[PDB]
PDB file of C-alpha atoms in Angstrom:
ATOM      1  CA  UNK A   1      62.067  -4.071  -7.631  1.00 19.16           C
ATOM      2  CA  UNK A   2      63.866  -3.049  -4.630  1.00 22.83           C
ATOM      3  CA  UNK A   3      65.573  -5.519  -1.439  1.00 23.75           C
ATOM      4  CA  UNK A   4      66.516  -3.873   1.887  1.00 23.43           C
ATOM      5  CA  UNK A   5      70.065  -3.874   2.515  1.00 24.54           C
ATOM      6  CA  UNK A   6      70.925  -2.217   5.857  1.00 24.88           C
ATOM      7  CA  UNK A   7      69.407  -0.025   8.232  1.00 25.71           C
ATOM      8  CA  UNK A   8      71.590   2.923   9.732  1.00 24.68           C
ATOM      9  CA  UNK A   9      70.829   5.735  12.707  1.00 26.02           C
ATOM     10  CA  UNK A  10      71.390   9.467  11.144  1.00 25.45           C
ATOM     11  CA  UNK A  11      70.601  12.910  12.078  1.00 24.22           C
ATOM     12  CA  UNK A  12      69.501  15.314   9.172  1.00 23.64           C
ATOM     13  CA  UNK A  13      70.212  18.990   8.932  1.00 27.33           C
ATOM     14  CA  UNK A  14      69.353  21.361   5.880  1.00 27.98           C
ATOM     15  CA  UNK A  15      72.374  24.148   4.734  1.00 29.01           C
ATOM     16  CA  UNK A  16      71.227  26.671   7.719  1.00 27.44           C
ATOM     17  CA  UNK A  17      72.967  23.424   9.893  1.00 25.34           C
ATOM     18  CA  UNK A  18      68.728  23.073  11.486  1.00 25.96           C
ATOM     19  CA  UNK A  19      68.295  20.019  12.455  1.00 24.80           C
ATOM     20  CA  UNK A  20      65.104  18.102  10.892  1.00 25.16           C
ATOM     21  CA  UNK A  21      62.461  16.661  14.078  1.00 26.41           C
ATOM     22  CA  UNK A  22      59.177  15.301  14.069  1.00 28.99           C
ATOM     23  CA  UNK A  23      57.109  17.752  16.284  1.00 31.07           C
ATOM     24  CA  UNK A  24      54.217  16.616  18.990  1.00 29.61           C
ATOM     25  CA  UNK A  25      51.673  16.797  15.718  1.00 30.33           C
ATOM     26  CA  UNK A  26      54.081  14.385  13.595  1.00 26.95           C
ATOM     27  CA  UNK A  27      55.426  17.308  11.408  1.00 22.25           C
ATOM     28  CA  UNK A  28      58.542  17.093   9.755  1.00 25.29           C
ATOM     29  CA  UNK A  29      59.759  20.643  11.117  1.00 26.47           C
ATOM     30  CA  UNK A  30      63.540  21.967  10.976  1.00 25.66           C
ATOM     31  CA  UNK A  31      65.201  24.000  13.605  1.00 24.52           C
ATOM     32  CA  UNK A  32      68.401  25.433  15.270  1.00 26.12           C
ATOM     33  CA  UNK A  33      69.489  22.729  18.002  1.00 27.36           C
ATOM     34  CA  UNK A  34      72.995  22.224  19.608  1.00 27.50           C
ATOM     35  CA  UNK A  35      74.124  18.765  20.278  1.00 29.23           C
ATOM     36  CA  UNK A  36      72.481  19.113  24.200  1.00 28.10           C
ATOM     37  CA  UNK A  37      69.007  20.092  22.064  1.00 23.51           C
ATOM     38  CA  UNK A  38      69.615  17.336  19.875  1.00 25.43           C
ATOM     39  CA  UNK A  39      70.104  14.923  22.396  1.00 25.29           C
ATOM     40  CA  UNK A  40      67.201  16.226  24.808  1.00 22.30           C
ATOM     41  CA  UNK A  41      64.755  15.259  21.665  1.00 25.46           C
ATOM     42  CA  UNK A  42      66.780  12.457  20.792  1.00 26.61           C
ATOM     43  CA  UNK A  43      63.524  10.150  20.029  1.00 24.86           C
ATOM     44  CA  UNK A  44      62.214  13.021  17.280  1.00 24.11           C
ATOM     45  CA  UNK A  45      65.667  13.654  16.149  1.00 21.69           C
ATOM     46  CA  UNK A  46      67.643  10.447  15.270  1.00 22.36           C
ATOM     47  CA  UNK A  47      66.384   8.982  11.926  1.00 23.47           C
ATOM     48  CA  UNK A  48      66.372   5.140  10.522  1.00 20.48           C
ATOM     49  CA  UNK A  49      68.109   5.475   6.974  1.00 19.44           C
ATOM     50  CA  UNK A  50      67.444   2.196   5.310  1.00 21.79           C
ATOM     51  CA  UNK A  51      69.196   1.588   2.071  1.00 21.99           C
ATOM     52  CA  UNK A  52      67.898  -0.823  -0.528  1.00 20.04           C
ATOM     53  CA  UNK A  53      69.278  -2.628  -4.055  1.00 20.36           C
ATOM     54  CA  UNK A  54      67.389  -1.900  -7.059  1.00 17.69           C
ATOM     55  CA  UNK A  55      66.766  -4.066 -10.013  1.00 20.48           C
ATOM     56  CA  UNK A  56      67.097  -0.582 -12.348  1.00 18.84           C
ATOM     57  CA  UNK A  57      69.853   1.362 -10.462  1.00 18.20           C
ATOM     58  CA  UNK A  58      69.468   5.467 -11.052  1.00 16.99           C
ATOM     59  CA  UNK A  59      70.628   6.680  -7.374  1.00 14.12           C
ATOM     60  CA  UNK A  60      70.921   5.163  -3.783  1.00 13.59           C
ATOM     61  CA  UNK A  61      67.619   3.933  -3.012  1.00 11.14           C
ATOM     62  CA  UNK A  62      67.023   4.444   0.772  1.00 11.67           C
ATOM     63  CA  UNK A  63      63.573   5.216   3.169  1.00  9.83           C
ATOM     64  CA  UNK A  64      63.642   7.750   5.910  1.00 11.93           C
ATOM     65  CA  UNK A  65      62.187   6.444   9.227  1.00 10.99           C
ATOM     66  CA  UNK A  66      61.642   7.436  12.963  1.00  8.04           C
ATOM     67  CA  UNK A  67      60.576   6.063  16.073  1.00  8.69           C
ATOM     68  CA  UNK A  68      57.890   8.327  18.311  1.00  9.00           C
ATOM     69  CA  UNK A  69      54.218   6.358  19.225  1.00  7.87           C
ATOM     70  CA  UNK A  70      55.711   3.770  16.859  1.00  7.70           C
ATOM     71  CA  UNK A  71      57.914   3.161  13.753  1.00  6.94           C
ATOM     72  CA  UNK A  72      56.765   5.758  10.684  1.00  8.15           C
ATOM     73  CA  UNK A  73      58.346   5.438   7.499  1.00 12.08           C
ATOM     74  CA  UNK A  74      58.698   8.919   5.481  1.00 13.95           C
ATOM     75  CA  UNK A  75      55.728   9.285   2.733  1.00 14.59           C
ATOM     76  CA  UNK A  76      55.853  11.541  -0.505  1.00 14.71           C
ATOM     77  CA  UNK A  77      52.283   9.802  -1.601  1.00 13.99           C
ATOM     78  CA  UNK A  78      50.042  12.302  -4.045  1.00 12.43           C
ATOM     79  CA  UNK A  79      53.160  14.858  -3.785  1.00 13.78           C
ATOM     80  CA  UNK A  80      52.588  15.536   0.082  1.00 13.33           C
ATOM     81  CA  UNK A  81      55.190  14.777   2.643  1.00 17.07           C
ATOM     82  CA  UNK A  82      53.839  13.092   5.856  1.00 15.70           C
ATOM     83  CA  UNK A  83      55.054   9.954   8.265  1.00 16.66           C
ATOM     84  CA  UNK A  84      53.139   7.118   7.697  1.00 17.54           C
ATOM     85  CA  UNK A  85      52.809   4.580  10.546  1.00 17.98           C
ATOM     86  CA  UNK A  86      54.880   1.411   9.034  1.00 17.63           C
ATOM     87  CA  UNK A  87      58.118  -0.395   9.113  1.00 17.54           C
ATOM     88  CA  UNK A  88      60.487   0.015   6.336  1.00 18.98           C
ATOM     89  CA  UNK A  89      59.504  -3.246   4.350  1.00 21.11           C
ATOM     90  CA  UNK A  90      62.240  -6.085   3.186  1.00 16.96           C
ATOM     91  CA  UNK A  91      60.750  -5.917  -0.499  1.00 19.53           C
ATOM     92  CA  UNK A  92      59.529  -3.309  -2.685  1.00 20.84           C
ATOM     93  CA  UNK A  93      57.660  -4.927  -5.642  1.00 23.87           C
ATOM     94  CA  UNK A  94      57.589  -1.723  -8.310  1.00 24.13           C
ATOM     95  CA  UNK A  95      60.016   0.228  -9.769  1.00 21.82           C
ATOM     96  CA  UNK A  96      58.380   3.213  -8.204  1.00 25.73           C
ATOM     97  CA  UNK A  97      57.577   3.897  -4.153  1.00 30.98           C
ATOM     98  CA  UNK A  98      56.101   6.663  -2.008  1.00 31.69           C
ATOM     99  CA  UNK A  99      58.544   5.840   0.597  1.00 31.91           C
ATOM    100  CA  UNK A 100      61.473   5.381  -1.565  1.00 31.89           C
ATOM    101  CA  UNK A 101      63.846   8.387  -2.478  1.00 32.41           C
ATOM    102  CA  UNK A 102      66.814   8.276  -4.557  1.00 31.19           C
ATOM    103  CA  UNK A 103      69.693   9.559  -2.327  1.00 31.28           C
ATOM    104  CA  UNK A 104      72.783  11.782  -4.607  1.00 32.46           C
ATOM    105  CA  UNK A 105      75.802  13.553  -3.509  1.00 33.47           C
ATOM    106  CA  UNK A 106      75.480  17.457  -4.986  1.00 34.23           C
ATOM    107  CA  UNK A 107      78.586  17.892  -7.310  1.00 32.98           C
ATOM    108  CA  UNK A 108      79.407  20.721  -5.534  1.00 36.85           C
ATOM    109  CA  UNK A 109      80.176  18.920  -2.557  1.00 37.90           C
ATOM    110  CA  UNK A 110      80.987  15.162  -0.764  1.00 36.28           C
ATOM    111  CA  UNK A 111      79.011  16.941   2.132  1.00 37.05           C
ATOM    112  CA  UNK A 112      75.756  18.178   0.881  1.00 37.69           C
ATOM    113  CA  UNK A 113      72.884  15.105  -0.270  1.00 38.56           C
ATOM    114  CA  UNK A 114      69.359  15.563  -2.070  1.00 38.40           C
ATOM    115  CA  UNK A 115      66.865  12.809  -2.016  1.00 36.06           C
ATOM    116  CA  UNK A 116      64.485  12.512  -5.590  1.00 38.08           C
ATOM    117  CA  UNK A 117      61.450  10.811  -5.344  1.00 38.50           C
ATOM    118  CA  UNK A 118      61.115   7.756  -7.166  1.00 37.14           C
ATOM    119  CA  UNK A 119      57.446   7.575  -7.734  1.00 38.02           C
ATOM    120  CA  UNK A 120      57.738  11.482  -8.861  1.00 40.60           C
ATOM    121  CA  UNK A 121      60.765  12.335 -10.853  1.00 41.79           C
ATOM    122  CA  UNK A 122      62.192  15.767 -10.944  1.00 40.98           C
ATOM    123  CA  UNK A 123      60.607  16.104  -7.145  1.00 41.83           C
ATOM    124  CA  UNK A 124      62.928  16.535  -4.528  1.00 41.69           C
ATOM    125  CA  UNK A 125      62.626  16.688  -0.390  1.00 44.31           C
ATOM    126  CA  UNK A 126      62.917  20.432   0.687  1.00 44.68           C
ATOM    127  CA  UNK A 127      63.232  22.498   3.012  1.00 44.40           C
ATOM    128  CA  UNK A 128      60.689  25.625   2.874  1.00 44.24           C
ATOM    129  CA  UNK A 129      59.740  28.432   5.534  1.00 43.75           C
ATOM    130  CA  UNK A 130      56.116  28.592   6.073  1.00 44.32           C
ATOM    131  CA  UNK A 131      55.168  31.569   8.405  1.00 42.58           C
ATOM    132  CA  UNK A 132      57.846  31.014  11.344  1.00 45.07           C
ATOM    133  CA  UNK A 133      57.982  27.630  10.600  1.00 46.10           C
ATOM    134  CA  UNK A 134      60.902  25.407   8.627  1.00 44.56           C
ATOM    135  CA  UNK A 135      58.756  22.838   6.950  1.00 44.55           C
ATOM    136  CA  UNK A 136      59.991  19.252   4.847  1.00 45.31           C
ATOM    137  CA  UNK A 137      58.266  19.409   1.244  1.00 46.92           C
ATOM    138  CA  UNK A 138      58.417  17.856  -1.694  1.00 46.39           C
ATOM    139  CA  UNK A 139      58.796  20.169  -4.614  1.00 48.92           C
ATOM    140  CA  UNK A 140      60.668  20.474  -8.417  1.00 48.62           C
ATOM    141  CA  UNK A 141      63.800  21.957  -8.718  1.00 47.78           C
ATOM    142  CA  UNK A 142      62.905  25.869  -8.446  1.00 47.34           C
ATOM    143  CA  UNK A 143      66.603  26.515  -9.854  1.00 48.89           C
ATOM    144  CA  UNK A 144      69.895  25.524 -10.301  1.00 50.34           C
ATOM    145  CA  UNK A 145      71.808  25.526  -7.129  1.00 50.41           C
ATOM    146  CA  UNK A 146      68.955  25.565  -5.003  1.00 49.56           C
ATOM    147  CA  UNK A 147      70.077  24.956  -1.383  1.00 48.46           C
ATOM    148  CA  UNK A 148      66.465  24.343  -0.040  1.00 47.59           C
ATOM    149  CA  UNK A 149      66.791  20.700  -1.458  1.00 46.92           C
ATOM    150  CA  UNK A 150      70.277  19.907   0.015  1.00 46.20           C
ATOM    151  CA  UNK A 151      70.709  18.269   3.069  1.00 45.64           C
ATOM    152  CA  UNK A 152      73.882  17.011   5.142  1.00 44.68           C
ATOM    153  CA  UNK A 153      73.426  13.210   6.178  1.00 49.10           C
ATOM    154  CA  UNK A 154      75.281  12.863   9.977  1.00 48.47           C
ATOM    155  CA  UNK A 155      75.958   9.006  10.581  1.00 46.01           C
ATOM    156  CA  UNK A 156      79.525  10.087  11.757  1.00 43.43           C
ATOM    157  CA  UNK A 157      81.178   7.901   8.886  1.00 44.06           C
TER     158      UNK A 157
END
């Protein structure tokens, strides 16, 4: 079971320094943004990372939320990434959740993070280029040192 500890404002970037954002169709996308662009698109680029206590510790348990039309929380339900209209809850009864990800620092860096699905072991949050768009997806670790599943969390310490 999970218990909410705190919620903090953060900006998420891939290894190309492209910042994670919610577009008009509520799609989690990645694009090149200066500190100016990032500031002008603030409700769509500022994410709420909520930290949870876990009765079965196996990585920093987190939810990822954003304020658009309403508070939306990131879900990997049926191994598909989407933002569902809900607040990060105070308590989660199971040992697995479609909105709970395990945040881990990549041994290569103190900056680089990875987000593994609690409900789908071996599946990670990833940036994948589809046509001319950089999309937030859920995938199995394709290879060792895969940069597509690595991110930076800017919470300014």
